[PDB]
Amino acid sequence: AAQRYNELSYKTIVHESERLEALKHALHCTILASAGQQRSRMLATLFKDERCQQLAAYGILEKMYLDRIIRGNQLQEFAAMLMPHQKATTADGSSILDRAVIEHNLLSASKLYNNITFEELGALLEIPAAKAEKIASQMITEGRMNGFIDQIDGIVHFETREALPTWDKQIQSLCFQVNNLLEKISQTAPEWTAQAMEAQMAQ
Amino acid sequence: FYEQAITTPAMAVSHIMLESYKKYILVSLILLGKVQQLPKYTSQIVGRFIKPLSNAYHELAQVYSTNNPSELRNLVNKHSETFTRDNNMGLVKQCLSSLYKKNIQRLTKTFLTLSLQDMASRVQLSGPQEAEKYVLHMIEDGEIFASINQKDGMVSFHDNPEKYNNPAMLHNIDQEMLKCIELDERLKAMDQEITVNPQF
Amino acid sequence: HIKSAIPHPLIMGVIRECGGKMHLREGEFEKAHTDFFEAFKNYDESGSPRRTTCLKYLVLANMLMKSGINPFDSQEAKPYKNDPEILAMTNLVSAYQNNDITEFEKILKTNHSNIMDDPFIREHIEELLRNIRTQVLIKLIKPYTRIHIPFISKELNIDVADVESLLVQCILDNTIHGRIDQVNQLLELDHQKRGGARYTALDKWTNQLNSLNQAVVSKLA
Amino acid sequence: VENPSLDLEQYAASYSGLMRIERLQFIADHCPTLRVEALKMALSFVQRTFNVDMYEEIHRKLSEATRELQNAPPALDTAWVEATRKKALLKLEKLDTDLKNYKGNSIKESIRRGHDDLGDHYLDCGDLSNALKCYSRARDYCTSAKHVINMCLNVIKVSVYLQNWSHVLSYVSKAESTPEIAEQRGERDSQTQAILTKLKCAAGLAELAARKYKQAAKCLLLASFDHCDFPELLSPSNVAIYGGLCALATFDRQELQRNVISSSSFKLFLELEPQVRDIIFKFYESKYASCLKMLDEMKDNLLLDMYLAPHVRTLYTQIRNRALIQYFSPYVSADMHRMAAAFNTTVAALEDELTQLILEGLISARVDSHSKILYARDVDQRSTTFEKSLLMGKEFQRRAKAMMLRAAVLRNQIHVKSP
């Protein structure tokens, strides 16, 4: 439905109100589910629209774009922006919107970790630790969470992906951070800009 | 050294070779669980004349293989005059003690936590006191990897000297590699010496 | 020998049913599936004395063949399944395919008459249950490095002895890769595997042979 | 060693011949008070089949048994003996004369038929050398390949008692691999022909004797249920026991579900075997107690199986070891008390069994015998390979000292010489 509504909003044969109607339903399809990968590509494509900046929930798409864990405030903001059939809590606990918000919150906690306990992820997202393990394993079942679960030690590790050849990639990144040191030379303070562009580069 | 004394090419049998062969069997029974195989390049007179002359020693190894200490004791008392005649009585007593130690070392492969009375019954020592003595001696000499629990009267076998992450192994491997490097430069010298000289 | 004589009567679906029946006798659901499949087709050609029943066995064949992908999916069964009497079979294939044991068993228990009366269904149901529980376990296992047997027992809602039997069964599957402390009743899986280890030893061994070739020649006169 | 779990009524029905005499022999070896009546029935049997020497032998051993029947509670019809023996020797001269007559008639079918029948009557005498002459002169004297097959079948019926499996197996394989079996048909296109299943039984006896039991069960896999008939060797319950238990003893669990449960050719044979089927069910469901129980119960009756008797002790030891491996495999920590309950044993004797297995086999563990509990062990391959490589380095250094001093004295080629 997101690709449906979005690429109907990009076509130009339709009436303009109907373009932005398809666009706002693409924003509904942005916020109501959590991001799948091509889904998130279409959401960032929506983020490049000034007409989406004309929409009411561009701050919600902004926090989707900045990989932000959604707090209750902007939650209730776009909850004021829903249609009541889209407000369906059909015996799933919290709503499809809200369960997918918890999905996106766990998703943002995934994108930023490398390990977190069931307890620290539970109190991180205001959920029980056993429920943190449960829904975290259900998202690894959904695959959009990835890592490895130690139930006994109580930690959903992410795939930590950090070692010494990764640190050798960080040595090439240390060449590019000597370049970023040149950026700090030209950047951080203007007296430091003049005097460091003198001293570290010309001397 | 005894092995290198036996390997010597020989047309006639000498008493030095006989005595070195007897002491070879004794030291191999002490150091290893059984008699170490001599190389194929050993003299024919060893297997033809020296072997059946020192019959008591191969008989001793034959009784050692059954893992019975009382029967080895009976055989040591049987040929005691022959062992004292060769003036190696003492090494055969070390063979008896090494058999006891071999029997206690066989327990690590099957048991983990074993009673001292059970050990005294299996190894044939009579009393948990002698079992505790033997286990303590064996831990001190680095022969077994075990612990003693006096309260319950138990012996706990561990069997984990190393995980091979120490520098100690780094230094061990460095020294062993230096020995192999020495041998190769030595082997290079021997090979060069042989290349120089060639036949005509 | 039907191959020998080819008339084309009305009865054709019945005999094809018998082949499946034979496979009922045998338990070779692979062949029975084709049997009931064509038989059901022939029943559509004939009418429904047996048609629904043939479909019942056909769905049963699908589950025993363990290929739910096209339960009704020919052309016709999909509309045929709509028959509420038979619709339960769709529920079975669903709950089986979806693996909702509660729902699946619910249909079994709720409909003894509809589902359970069949002795083959009643017969194979446990095997079916093993398959479902096995798959659910497979789904359960992948994320875990280590797990508690009692956790599994609570999870799957089956007895610990049953759990152990199933686990061992999974080992037969070569599915479980890890050891189980029977006394402790826990399972450790080799989640992080490594066939990294051998090569150092292998190279060592190759060198050892090298040493062999070198030593025998050199040491030898 | 007396087991009363035998069925001699079936062996009187399904069998006859020397085995009726021979299983009594194991009675006469180990299982007494089951002897005298079947000895007299066998004596009445050898009142047929032209045999007088072994008739008098059964009369003699029955007189021995009668001397034993001076404590417990024989027939020599010398008229029959002399009449039948003179008839048999005169018919030997009749058929030597008929051999002359039929070489005059020159029908290699009928001539080699006479060779076959004379070897049959030398089996009826017990003259295995003279039957070996007759079938040796029926050997390359046939007409079709089917008749060579029948010749080798008769030689294999002798080979039941020859068992001289150097060239007795050359006759067995001359029936097995040689005669292009039924000339590329397979005992004429879906066998009822009791030939290949006779080769199952023959390879079973052979690698019973020659002790490669895996190939024996590999033969015994695919027997046909169609015929199942011979009064000395083939009854489908007994051959069912043979094939099922050799396959259970010799084949891995991959094949124990892949070729034992799936064995449809042998399926009705295990339908004749409810207890073997239940042992299969319990072992595959790892129900070690009642499985090894029924195993060792019928171990005595397969010790009553005379040829299986020395090998059933080996193979049920293997099956119990297979059950112990089946227990030991899936865990890291198994209680031996659970294992004592599972294998109907104690802890310590079970521990000695496991220690016997520790000597070579698949028990990688440490037992805390302070707690008397097994603890399975993954021997680390990193530790294993580093250990053996650095011990190889130590042996490399001992061989270094060996080659250095040895070549410092013998690259000189100078030694302890003759004086």
State how far residue D253 is from chain C, nearest Cα, in angstroms. 8
- Which amino acid belongs to residue B111? F
- Which amino acid belongs to residue D145? A
Which residue among D378, D392, D403 places its CB closest to the CB of C219? D403
Across the interface, whether the CB atoms of C183 and D403 are under 8 A apart is answered: no
Across the interface, whether the CB atoms of C143 and A149 are under 8 A apart is answered: yes
Q: Pick from D228, D260, D258, D264: which is nearest to D243 by CA?
A: D260
SS3 assignment, position D363: coil
Sheet holding A115-117, edge to edge: A115-117, A155-158, A147-150
Inter-CA distances, D372 with A144, B112, B131, D334, D350, Å? 47, 8, 19, 11, 11
Among D267, D332, D401, D409, which would you mutate to test the C interface (most chain C Cβ atoms within 10 Å of its Cβ)? D332
Question: Do residues A132 and A122 touch, judged by C-beta distance below 8 A?
Answer: yes
Among C179, C199, C219, which would you mutate to test the D interface (most chain D Cβ atoms within 10 Å of its Cβ)? C179
From chain A residues 126-165, the ones with a CB under 8 A of any chain C CB are 137, 140-141, 148-152
First-to-last C-alpha distance (Å) of chain C: 78
Across the interface, whether the CB atoms of A149 and C139 are under 8 A apart is answered: no
Q: Which residues of D216-244 are buried (b: 16+ CB within 10 A; e: fewer)?
A: bbbbbbbbbbebbebebbbbbebbbbbbb
Question: Do residues D157 and D232 touch, judged by C-beta distance below 8 A?
Answer: yes
Write the Ramachandran bin of A65: left for phi over 0, alpha for psi from -120 to 50, otherwise beta.
Answer: alpha
Q: Which residue of B has its CA nearest to D400?
A: B183
Question: Do residues A109 and A122 touch, judged by C-beta distance below 8 A?
Answer: no
Angle at alpha carbon of residue D408, lines to D407 and D410, rounded to 5°: 55
* DSSP-assigned beta bridge partners for residue C144: A149
| Non-local CB neighbours of C104 within 8 Å, separated by 6+ positions | C92, C95, C96, C132
Across the interface, whether the CB atoms of A151 and C191 are under 8 A apart is answered: no
State how far residue A140 is from chain C, nearest Cα, in angstroms. 8
Q: Could you tell me whether strands B113-115 and B154-157 are parallel, antiparallel, or unpaired per DSSP bridges?
A: antiparallel
Torsion, CA C49, CA C50, CA C56, CA C61, rounded to 10: -160
Q: Which residues of C157-194 are buried (b: 16+ CB within 10 A; e: fewer)?
A: ebeeeebbbbbbbbbbeeebebbbbbbebbbbbebeee
Q: Pick from B99, B118, B125: which is nearest to B157 by CA?
A: B118
Tokens linked to D98: 């008929």
Give, for A32, the enclosing helix (H) or strand (E): none
* DSSP-assigned beta bridge partners for residue B147: B156
Which of the other chains make 3 or more beta carbon contacts under 8 angstroms with chain C?
A: A, D
In the block, residue with structure tokens 């008749």: D147
Tokens linked to D380: 């680390």
Across the interface, whether the CB atoms of C139 and A150 are under 8 A apart is answered: no
Tokens linked to D192: 């009822």
Contacts of D383 in chain B (CB under 8 A): 162-164
Across the interface, whether the CB atoms of D393 and B180 are under 8 A apart is answered: yes
Q: Which residue of C has its CA nearest to D337?
A: C183
Answer whether C139 touches A (CB < 8 Å): yes
Tokens linked to C219: 């040491």
SS3 assignment, position C89: helix
Which of the other chains make 3 or more beta carbon contacts under 8 angstroms with chain A?
A: C
Tokens linked to A97: 């919107």
- Pairwise CA distance, residues A104 & A101, whole Å: 5
- Pairwise CA distance, residues B43 & B39, whole Å: 9
User: Helices D145-162 & D128-136, crossing angle to 10 degrees?
Assistant: 160
From chain C residues 156-215, the ones with a CB under 8 A of any chain D CB are 165, 167-168, 171-172, 176, 179-184, 188, 197-198, 200-201, 204, 208, 211, 215
Evaluated on CA atoms D26, D28, D30, D35, the torsion sign reads positive
Backbone angles phi, psi at D142, to 5 degrees: -95, -175
Contacts of C200 in chain D (CB under 8 A): 385-386, 389
Question: What's the number of CA atoms in the CB half-sphere (13 Å) around residue A6?
Answer: 21
Tokens linked to A116: 């977190």
- Which amino acid belongs to residue B159? D
Which residue among D367, D406, D417 places its CB closest to the CB of B112? D367
State how far residue B80 is from chain D, nearest Cα, in angstroms. 32
Question: Do residues B144 and B108 touch, judged by C-beta distance below 8 A?
Answer: yes
Question: Do residues D50 and D88 touch, judged by C-beta distance below 8 A?
Answer: yes
- Pairwise CA distance, residues C16 & C45, whole Å: 13
Residues in chain A, total: 203
Contacts of B109 in chain D (CB under 8 A): 355, 358-359
Across the interface, whether the CB atoms of D369 and B114 are under 8 A apart is answered: yes
- Pairwise CA distance, residues C164 & C184, whole Å: 12
Question: Do residues D3 and D300 touch, judged by C-beta distance below 8 A?
Answer: yes
Q: Where are the beta strands (DSSP E) in chain A?
A: 115-117, 147-150, 155-158
Residues in chain D, total: 419
> Can you say how many angstroms the Cα of residue D240 is from the centroid of all Cα atoms in its chain?
13
Q: Which residue of B has its CA nearest to D379?
A: B160
Question: Do residues C183 and D340 touch, judged by C-beta distance below 8 A?
Answer: no
Across the interface, whether the CB atoms of B115 and D369 are under 8 A apart is answered: yes
Among C98, C141, C142, C193, which would you mutate to test the A interface (most chain A Cβ atoms within 10 Å of its Cβ)? C142
Backbone angles phi, psi at D365, to 5 degrees: -165, 170
Contacts of C167 in chain D (CB under 8 A): 330
Tokens linked to D121: 């009557």
* DSSP-assigned beta bridge partners for residue A147: A158
Which residue among C145, C147, C186 places its CB closest to the CB of A148? C145
